[PDB]
Amino acid sequence: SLEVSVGKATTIYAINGSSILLPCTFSSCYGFENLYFKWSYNNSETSRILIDGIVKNDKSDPKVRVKDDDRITLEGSTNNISILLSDLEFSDTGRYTCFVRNDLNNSATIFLQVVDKL
Amino acid sequence: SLEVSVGKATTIYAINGSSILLPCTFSSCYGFENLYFKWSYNNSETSRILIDGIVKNDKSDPKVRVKDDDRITLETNNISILLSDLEFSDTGRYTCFVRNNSATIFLQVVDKLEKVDNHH
């Protein structure tokens, strides 16, 4: 089997007020334990946590524990931890980091540029 | 043995006259040899295979076989090509396939103002 992909980092442009999906799927040929992940947000000034979560196993799916932005929604059918950020605002521009945990310490980065409707 | 990806498709906005890196990476959990890869360019006016070659294995750098113009070169085994001195004509769909799926990059060449309206 093979897993060809674009990489861990991509840039994405989205219209203010719309919804945007920040993608992250992960793969292990190992098979695994409980598997921890989290979405953080960064800019020049500060950084906040968006959601954290767990996949009980490859046979189950990614489920969320912590949620600090009600606009975040995690849904996807490679297990996929992509999230859908709704009700976009201009201050949502920044870097969205998705970190994963069975050592393991792999992260995916999404640079999100919010633009106006013209 | 944990790999993360932001998908098999992305869009890339690139600056005219600048240089862009078109990313493709592949993972496997078996050792592989003679893994053949190709890059194809698809445009409204034309379709063409950019470059191809093989990664002999995880040991070595990839060996390019079919070469494209002067202006595509090659860089967790990494197949990403670098496109230098972009021109608007380079806009199109760049697809990287690894023969035994593929990653698709939709490259839009643009230009940027120095600033926004009236800076300090």
Author numbering:
A (entry chain A): 30 to 106, 111 to 135, 140 to 155
B (entry chain B): 30 to 104, 111 to 135, 143 to 162
Reproduce passages from the article:
Voltage-gated sodium channels are transmembrane proteins responsible for the generation of action potentials in excitable cells and play important roles in the propagation of electrical impulses throughout nerves. They are complexes of a pore-forming α subunit and auxiliary β subunits, designated β1/β1B–β4 (encoded by SCN1B–4B). In addition to the channel modulation, the β subunits function as cell adhesion molecules. In this study, we determined the crystal structures of the mouse and human β4ex proteins containing all three Cys residues, which revealed the formation of a dimer in a parallel arrangement, mediated by the intermolecular disulfide bond and the exchange of the N-terminal segments.
In this study, a slightly different all-Cys construct of the mouse β4ex protein with a C-terminal tag sequence was prepared. This sample was crystallized under different conditions than those employed in the previous analysis, and the crystal structure was determined in the cubic crystal form at 3.1-Å resolution. The same parallel arrangement was also observed in the previous monoclinic crystal form in addition to the anti-parallel arrangement. The anti-parallel arrangement was not observed in the cubic and hexagonal crystal forms, probably because PEG fragments were bound to the trans homophilic interface (hexagonal form) and because detergent was used for the crystallization and the C-terminal tag sequence was present (cubic form) (see “Experimental Procedures”). The parallel arrangement of the β4 molecules was mediated, in common, through two types of interactions. First, the β4ex structure forms the intermolecular disulfide bond (the S–S interaction) between the “unpaired” Cys residue (Cys58) in the loop connecting strands B and C. Second, the N-terminal segment Ser30-Val35, which is deleted in another structure of β4ex, is involved in an intermolecular interaction between the two β4ex molecules in the parallel arrangement. This type of interaction is designated hereafter as the N–N interaction. Moreover, in this N–N interaction, the N-terminal segments form hydrogen bonds between their Glu32 and Ser34 with Ser56 and Thr54, respectively, and join the β sheets of the counterparts.
